[PDB]
DNA sequence: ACTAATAGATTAGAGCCGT
RNA sequence: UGACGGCUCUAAUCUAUUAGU
């Protein structure tokens, strides 16, 4: 008989430091941790796209009721949740003609096609930023379906990448999402039906817009102080790999600071997904210096986690650049071995947060399960748990589980209950997808607002 | 004294608005009395003695609700005795309610507009409350926190009863007590595949590692008759299972690797005699039932082969045996599709698309029952099934998966 | 040293549907 | 690319071992 320990849900801080377990409830009830004065929109689309965007903004002004209000919380309205104003009449609209898109699409070179499609939008964005005195906080790109389907060296990745040197928060919204009712797959019904999940769509879009405009919808507090939760992701370039790091830590005021820690670390090696000692030493020196400048003193622990296992050489380099009094914990999180738990009598999956301890150096954690708070399980099918292995260093296998579960609750790109994989890894993955989509940057911005 | 703000509304529909507003007002230090937040005698009592304001969540149904108009009727009465014209405050929320269908007891009054956005309406409501000098306590998040949890943050509660979870791990009941390293390097003809032997065997170094004995390989491996059965290295498996065995000839890691390879090959071989039809995956081996092999194409009162539109879906499994944490046979569920139940559709995209749609129908219990019934078919004896690795050497697999018990449950 | 084979492992990706 | 999740198809590396160059 195998015993499953349980890890309880962590609490995320909201306005006035009040705690809750669901962003969709904590925000609607309490309000964001930091409030902004308002959001100046910026739209780069057609007249059709501008009309759609204004319609959607005014629609989310009013409360949004989704079909199953009990399982997924309703949307009070943008100003009702966040406390700032987001009007559809303050749009600094920059028109894009379908004809110039058409002449771009007719070019033989696909790489030049996607480069020119990115260039159109980004150059219009740059022109407005440098010419229009109207301050724009977030630029919302209402792209048509032709861009999405004809152009497939990715539109989104390059577009986010080529704006990094100018530091402009952007939000791509395909017109299929905003006008889903009038986008039908010739059957007479929408291509993807948002009817029962309209409120959750409003939640996600509004949260993404609020975050990118300088607001912090919620912050974490249920993590150990003095620890720099650091995540690495490796991305393929074809025979080079590209490491990207994201770091989360508590400050002097006990406020979680979540920021990227990315520097170029390119390794070309037969043995892939490993770092040379120089790259690793750079990596760790950058992270430690960032913690030092944010808090003064050095961390009491460097909780390095990744989807891969570390070899000896890079760990020795890590230890060599590490000062004294600081411990290093290298944790590998894998989601490949199928351990599907079926409940004996019933029809709803295992509760989220259950944890199976293999031994002192490994565990299974069900970061995806059935959450009673929303009554809606995060997985349609049986949820595969994440295998958390303490690859290197000394740690408590339950403490690592609770730390990972806490790190699974800071996805600002979506206002879901919690993320299946820890957020630092997923955001580092997004950074790697973007930072490797254009030319090398001397100093990429360390704020996710520009990436997600 | 009367220091409470009564909130009236339709019971099954206006819950969302009133819940937000009541919690919003409570968070600001007010004392709110809502039926959802908190019998007719009681309702009247508050409106008659406890209530200081009567906020009417007005909508196209709250004015057609017989029980609400009664609360309005008593509210009209109480308003007179208090000599307060500003007692009933008609919060209009419904979009289509436009000041022409209002009930006569509220039409003479000016509403607070919530039709265009709730935030300005709450801004309007608070303005009216202060204009009318309604007293309010400090918005302490303590007693107010209690109401918040009693409403939602107590619901977060996790039922603390014990549940039983059926996984997909099938432990290996038994292994042969000894691992043998035979020598047929001089007896192995060039170009012969070790995979074609009747029993599982792996060619490690200048040897042949298998769980069978020397003479077990005679037809497949020629000249083994002349071979001295003393040309073999013996290794207690339990020693390697504990990791104790680590000689310069072979390490514990490599020996366990060879054990896993033997396990997988033995599973593949037994499936050939078990009469299951094989479908190749990208990096694993799937097994499913040809239509008609089962009685009525179902077993243990659980359908394992069925029909989806023009295609036939076949429940399938793939096995990979692991020694960590402990020796088990990890089984994975799959769905395979055939045209007329005979031959497999040769389009991977079509197979994937058919499965993605078929997956919607099946549930937790549906997958568990199908997996357990499909495994129980493998059973040779009452409570297990054996995998052949030698002439007299068997490995026993529990036909039931490992049970996992948890201290936590939900309402279900 | 360097290629080929048989594995098992460990990681990438590309993809395609569901909600 | 509002999202999340499951799955499917490729691909390489690592390690061991043999073969060959
Ligand atoms: Mg985003």
CSV table of N, CA and C in Angstrom, one decimal, chain A residues 42-138:
chain,number,residue,atom,x,y,z
A,42,UNK,N,-3.1,51.0,-27.8
A,42,UNK,CA,-2.5,51.2,-29.1
A,42,UNK,C,-2.8,50.1,-30.1
A,43,UNK,N,-3.3,50.4,-31.2
A,43,UNK,CA,-3.8,49.4,-32.1
A,43,UNK,C,-3.2,49.5,-33.5
A,44,UNK,N,-2.7,48.4,-34.0
A,44,UNK,CA,-2.1,48.3,-35.4
A,44,UNK,C,-2.9,47.3,-36.1
A,45,UNK,N,-4.0,47.8,-36.8
A,45,UNK,CA,-4.9,46.9,-37.5
A,45,UNK,C,-5.6,47.6,-38.6
A,46,UNK,N,-6.5,46.9,-39.2
A,46,UNK,CA,-7.4,47.5,-40.3
A,46,UNK,C,-8.5,48.3,-39.6
A,47,UNK,N,-9.3,48.9,-40.4
A,47,UNK,CA,-10.6,49.5,-39.9
A,47,UNK,C,-11.5,48.4,-39.3
A,48,UNK,N,-11.5,47.2,-40.0
A,48,UNK,CA,-12.2,46.1,-39.4
A,48,UNK,C,-11.6,45.7,-38.1
A,49,UNK,N,-10.3,45.6,-38.0
A,49,UNK,CA,-9.6,45.2,-36.8
A,49,UNK,C,-9.8,46.3,-35.7
A,50,UNK,N,-9.8,47.6,-36.0
A,50,UNK,CA,-10.0,48.6,-35.0
A,50,UNK,C,-11.4,48.5,-34.5
A,51,UNK,N,-12.4,48.3,-35.4
A,51,UNK,CA,-13.8,48.2,-35.0
A,51,UNK,C,-14.0,47.0,-34.0
A,52,UNK,N,-13.3,45.9,-34.4
A,52,UNK,CA,-13.4,44.7,-33.5
A,52,UNK,C,-12.8,45.0,-32.2
A,53,UNK,N,-11.7,45.6,-32.1
A,53,UNK,CA,-11.0,45.9,-30.9
A,53,UNK,C,-11.8,46.8,-30.0
A,54,UNK,N,-12.4,47.9,-30.6
A,54,UNK,CA,-13.2,48.8,-29.8
A,54,UNK,C,-14.5,48.1,-29.3
A,55,UNK,N,-15.1,47.2,-30.1
A,55,UNK,CA,-16.2,46.5,-29.7
A,55,UNK,C,-15.9,45.6,-28.5
A,56,UNK,N,-14.7,44.9,-28.6
A,56,UNK,CA,-14.4,44.0,-27.5
A,56,UNK,C,-14.0,44.7,-26.2
A,57,UNK,N,-13.4,45.9,-26.3
A,57,UNK,CA,-13.1,46.6,-25.1
A,57,UNK,C,-14.3,47.1,-24.5
A,58,UNK,N,-15.3,47.6,-25.2
A,58,UNK,CA,-16.5,48.1,-24.6
A,58,UNK,C,-17.3,46.9,-24.1
A,59,UNK,N,-17.2,45.7,-24.7
A,59,UNK,CA,-17.8,44.5,-24.2
A,59,UNK,C,-17.3,44.1,-22.9
A,60,UNK,N,-16.0,44.1,-22.7
A,60,UNK,CA,-15.4,43.8,-21.4
A,60,UNK,C,-15.5,44.9,-20.4
A,61,UNK,N,-16.0,46.1,-20.8
A,61,UNK,CA,-16.4,47.1,-19.9
A,61,UNK,C,-17.6,46.6,-19.0
A,62,UNK,N,-18.5,46.0,-19.7
A,62,UNK,CA,-19.7,45.4,-19.0
A,62,UNK,C,-19.3,44.1,-18.4
A,63,UNK,N,-20.0,43.6,-17.4
A,63,UNK,CA,-19.8,42.2,-16.9
A,63,UNK,C,-20.0,41.2,-17.9
A,64,UNK,N,-19.2,40.1,-17.9
A,64,UNK,CA,-19.2,39.0,-18.8
A,64,UNK,C,-19.7,37.8,-18.1
A,65,UNK,N,-20.8,37.2,-18.5
A,65,UNK,CA,-21.3,36.0,-17.9
A,65,UNK,C,-21.1,34.8,-18.8
A,66,UNK,N,-20.3,33.8,-18.4
A,66,UNK,CA,-20.1,32.6,-19.1
A,66,UNK,C,-21.1,31.5,-18.7
A,67,UNK,N,-21.3,30.5,-19.5
A,67,UNK,CA,-22.5,29.6,-19.3
A,67,UNK,C,-22.4,28.9,-17.9
A,68,UNK,N,-21.3,28.4,-17.6
A,68,UNK,CA,-21.1,27.7,-16.3
A,68,UNK,C,-20.5,28.6,-15.3
A,69,UNK,N,-21.3,29.6,-14.8
A,69,UNK,CA,-20.8,30.6,-13.9
A,69,UNK,C,-20.3,30.0,-12.6
A,70,UNK,N,-20.8,28.8,-12.2
A,70,UNK,CA,-20.4,28.2,-10.9
A,70,UNK,C,-19.0,27.7,-11.0
A,71,UNK,N,-18.7,27.0,-12.1
A,71,UNK,CA,-17.3,26.4,-12.1
A,71,UNK,C,-16.3,27.4,-12.5
A,72,UNK,N,-16.6,28.3,-13.4
A,72,UNK,CA,-15.6,29.3,-13.8
A,72,UNK,C,-16.1,30.7,-13.5
A,73,UNK,N,-15.4,31.4,-12.6
A,73,UNK,CA,-16.0,32.7,-12.1
A,73,UNK,C,-16.2,33.7,-13.2
A,74,UNK,N,-17.3,34.5,-13.1
A,74,UNK,CA,-17.7,35.5,-14.1
A,74,UNK,C,-16.7,36.7,-14.0
A,75,UNK,N,-16.8,37.5,-15.1
A,75,UNK,CA,-16.0,38.7,-15.2
A,75,UNK,C,-16.8,39.9,-14.8
A,76,UNK,N,-16.4,40.6,-13.7
A,76,UNK,CA,-17.2,41.8,-13.3
A,76,UNK,C,-17.1,42.9,-14.4
A,77,UNK,N,-16.0,43.0,-15.1
A,77,UNK,CA,-15.8,44.2,-15.9
A,77,UNK,C,-14.4,44.6,-15.6
A,78,UNK,N,-13.7,45.2,-16.6
A,78,UNK,CA,-12.3,45.6,-16.5
A,78,UNK,C,-12.0,46.5,-15.3
A,79,UNK,N,-12.8,47.6,-15.2
A,79,UNK,CA,-12.5,48.6,-14.2
A,79,UNK,C,-13.0,48.1,-12.8
A,80,UNK,N,-14.0,47.2,-12.8
A,80,UNK,CA,-14.5,46.6,-11.6
A,80,UNK,C,-13.5,45.7,-10.9
A,81,UNK,N,-12.6,45.1,-11.7
A,81,UNK,CA,-11.6,44.2,-11.1
A,81,UNK,C,-10.3,44.9,-10.7
A,82,UNK,N,-9.7,45.6,-11.7
A,82,UNK,CA,-8.4,46.1,-11.5
A,82,UNK,C,-8.4,47.6,-11.0
A,83,UNK,N,-9.4,48.3,-11.1
A,83,UNK,CA,-9.5,49.6,-10.5
A,83,UNK,C,-9.0,50.7,-11.4
A,84,UNK,N,-8.5,50.4,-12.6
A,84,UNK,CA,-8.0,51.4,-13.5
A,84,UNK,C,-9.0,51.5,-14.7
A,85,UNK,N,-8.8,52.5,-15.5
A,85,UNK,CA,-9.7,52.7,-16.7
A,85,UNK,C,-9.0,52.2,-18.0
A,86,UNK,N,-9.8,51.5,-18.8
A,86,UNK,CA,-9.4,51.0,-20.1
A,86,UNK,C,-10.5,51.3,-21.1
A,87,UNK,N,-10.4,52.5,-21.7
A,87,UNK,CA,-11.4,53.0,-22.6
A,87,UNK,C,-11.0,52.6,-24.1
A,88,UNK,N,-12.1,52.3,-24.9
A,88,UNK,CA,-11.8,52.0,-26.3
A,88,UNK,C,-11.8,53.2,-27.2
A,89,UNK,N,-11.9,54.4,-26.6
A,89,UNK,CA,-11.9,55.7,-27.3
A,89,UNK,C,-10.6,56.3,-27.4
A,90,UNK,N,-9.6,55.8,-26.6
A,90,UNK,CA,-8.3,56.4,-26.5
A,90,UNK,C,-7.3,55.7,-27.3
A,91,UNK,N,-7.7,55.2,-28.5
A,91,UNK,CA,-6.9,54.3,-29.3
A,91,UNK,C,-6.1,55.2,-30.3
A,92,UNK,N,-4.8,55.0,-30.2
A,92,UNK,CA,-3.8,55.6,-31.2
A,92,UNK,C,-3.7,54.7,-32.4
A,93,UNK,N,-4.7,54.7,-33.3
A,93,UNK,CA,-4.8,53.7,-34.3
A,93,UNK,C,-3.9,54.0,-35.5
A,94,UNK,N,-3.2,52.9,-35.9
A,94,UNK,CA,-2.3,53.0,-37.1
A,94,UNK,C,-2.8,52.0,-38.1
A,95,UNK,N,-3.4,52.5,-39.2
A,95,UNK,CA,-4.1,51.6,-40.1
A,95,UNK,C,-3.1,50.8,-40.9
A,96,UNK,N,-3.4,49.5,-41.1
A,96,UNK,CA,-2.7,48.6,-42.0
A,96,UNK,C,-3.7,48.2,-43.1
A,97,UNK,N,-3.3,48.4,-44.4
A,97,UNK,CA,-4.1,48.1,-45.5
A,97,UNK,C,-3.9,46.6,-45.9
A,98,UNK,N,-5.0,46.0,-46.3
A,98,UNK,CA,-5.0,44.6,-46.8
A,98,UNK,C,-4.1,44.5,-48.0
A,99,UNK,N,-4.0,45.6,-48.8
A,99,UNK,CA,-3.3,45.5,-50.1
A,99,UNK,C,-1.8,45.4,-49.9
A,100,UNK,N,-1.2,46.1,-48.9
A,100,UNK,CA,0.2,46.0,-48.6
A,100,UNK,C,0.5,44.6,-48.1
A,101,UNK,N,-0.4,44.1,-47.2
A,101,UNK,CA,-0.2,42.7,-46.8
A,101,UNK,C,-0.3,41.7,-48.0
A,102,UNK,N,-1.2,42.0,-49.0
A,102,UNK,CA,-1.3,41.2,-50.1
A,102,UNK,C,0.0,41.2,-51.0
A,103,UNK,N,0.6,42.4,-51.2
A,103,UNK,CA,1.8,42.4,-52.0
A,103,UNK,C,3.0,41.8,-51.2
A,104,UNK,N,3.0,41.9,-49.9
A,104,UNK,CA,4.0,41.1,-49.1
A,104,UNK,C,3.8,39.6,-49.3
A,105,UNK,N,2.6,39.1,-49.3
A,105,UNK,CA,2.3,37.7,-49.3
A,105,UNK,C,2.7,37.1,-50.7
A,106,UNK,N,2.7,37.9,-51.7
A,106,UNK,CA,3.0,37.4,-53.1
A,106,UNK,C,4.5,37.2,-53.3
A,107,UNK,N,5.4,37.6,-52.4
A,107,UNK,CA,6.8,37.4,-52.6
A,107,UNK,C,7.1,35.9,-52.5
A,108,UNK,N,8.0,35.5,-53.4
A,108,UNK,CA,8.4,34.1,-53.5
A,108,UNK,C,9.1,33.6,-52.2
A,109,UNK,N,10.0,34.4,-51.7
A,109,UNK,CA,10.7,34.0,-50.5
A,109,UNK,C,9.9,34.0,-49.2
A,110,UNK,N,9.7,32.8,-48.7
A,110,UNK,CA,8.9,32.7,-47.4
A,110,UNK,C,9.6,33.4,-46.3
A,111,UNK,N,10.9,33.3,-46.1
A,111,UNK,CA,11.6,34.0,-45.1
A,111,UNK,C,11.5,35.5,-45.3
A,112,UNK,N,11.7,36.0,-46.5
A,112,UNK,CA,11.4,37.4,-46.7
A,112,UNK,C,10.0,37.8,-46.5
A,113,UNK,N,9.0,36.9,-46.8
A,113,UNK,CA,7.6,37.1,-46.6
A,113,UNK,C,7.4,37.4,-45.1
A,114,UNK,N,7.9,36.5,-44.3
A,114,UNK,CA,7.6,36.7,-42.8
A,114,UNK,C,8.4,37.9,-42.3
A,115,UNK,N,9.6,38.1,-42.8
A,115,UNK,CA,10.4,39.3,-42.3
A,115,UNK,C,9.6,40.5,-42.7
A,116,UNK,N,9.1,40.6,-43.9
A,116,UNK,CA,8.4,41.8,-44.3
A,116,UNK,C,7.1,42.0,-43.5
A,117,UNK,N,6.4,40.9,-43.3
A,117,UNK,CA,5.1,41.0,-42.5
A,117,UNK,C,5.4,41.5,-41.1
A,118,UNK,N,6.5,41.0,-40.4
A,118,UNK,CA,6.9,41.5,-39.2
A,118,UNK,C,7.3,43.0,-39.3
A,119,UNK,N,8.1,43.3,-40.3
A,119,UNK,CA,8.6,44.7,-40.5
A,119,UNK,C,7.5,45.7,-40.6
A,120,UNK,N,6.5,45.4,-41.4
A,120,UNK,CA,5.3,46.3,-41.5
A,120,UNK,C,4.8,46.8,-40.2
A,121,UNK,N,4.4,45.8,-39.4
A,121,UNK,CA,3.8,46.1,-38.1
A,121,UNK,C,4.8,46.8,-37.2
A,122,UNK,N,6.1,46.3,-37.1
A,122,UNK,CA,7.0,46.8,-36.1
A,122,UNK,C,7.4,48.2,-36.5
A,123,UNK,N,7.6,48.5,-37.8
A,123,UNK,CA,8.0,49.8,-38.3
A,123,UNK,C,6.8,50.8,-38.0
A,124,UNK,N,5.6,50.4,-38.2
A,124,UNK,CA,4.5,51.3,-37.9
A,124,UNK,C,4.5,51.6,-36.4
A,125,UNK,N,4.7,50.5,-35.6
A,125,UNK,CA,4.7,50.7,-34.1
A,125,UNK,C,5.9,51.7,-33.8
A,126,UNK,N,7.1,51.5,-34.3
A,126,UNK,CA,8.2,52.4,-34.0
A,126,UNK,C,7.9,53.8,-34.4
A,127,UNK,N,7.3,54.0,-35.6
A,127,UNK,CA,7.0,55.4,-36.1
A,127,UNK,C,6.1,56.1,-35.1
A,128,UNK,N,5.0,55.4,-34.7
A,128,UNK,CA,4.0,56.1,-33.8
A,128,UNK,C,4.7,56.4,-32.4
A,129,UNK,N,5.5,55.5,-31.9
A,129,UNK,CA,6.2,55.7,-30.6
A,129,UNK,C,7.1,56.9,-30.7
A,130,UNK,N,7.8,57.1,-31.8
A,130,UNK,CA,8.7,58.3,-31.9
A,130,UNK,C,8.0,59.5,-32.3
A,131,UNK,N,6.8,59.4,-33.0
A,131,UNK,CA,6.2,60.6,-33.5
A,131,UNK,C,4.9,61.0,-32.7
A,132,UNK,N,4.0,60.1,-32.4
A,132,UNK,CA,2.8,60.4,-31.7
A,132,UNK,C,3.1,60.7,-30.2
A,133,UNK,N,2.8,61.9,-29.8
A,133,UNK,CA,3.0,62.4,-28.4
A,133,UNK,C,2.1,61.6,-27.5
A,134,UNK,N,0.9,61.1,-28.1
A,134,UNK,CA,0.0,60.3,-27.3
A,134,UNK,C,0.7,59.1,-26.7
A,135,UNK,N,0.8,59.1,-25.4
A,135,UNK,CA,1.6,58.0,-24.7
A,135,UNK,C,0.8,56.7,-24.9
A,136,UNK,N,1.5,55.6,-25.4
A,136,UNK,CA,0.8,54.3,-25.5
A,136,UNK,C,1.5,53.3,-24.6
A,137,UNK,N,0.7,52.7,-23.7
A,137,UNK,CA,1.3,51.7,-22.8
A,137,UNK,C,1.5,50.4,-23.4
A,138,UNK,N,0.5,49.8,-24.0
A,138,UNK,CA,0.5,48.5,-24.7
A,138,UNK,C,0.0,48.7,-26.1
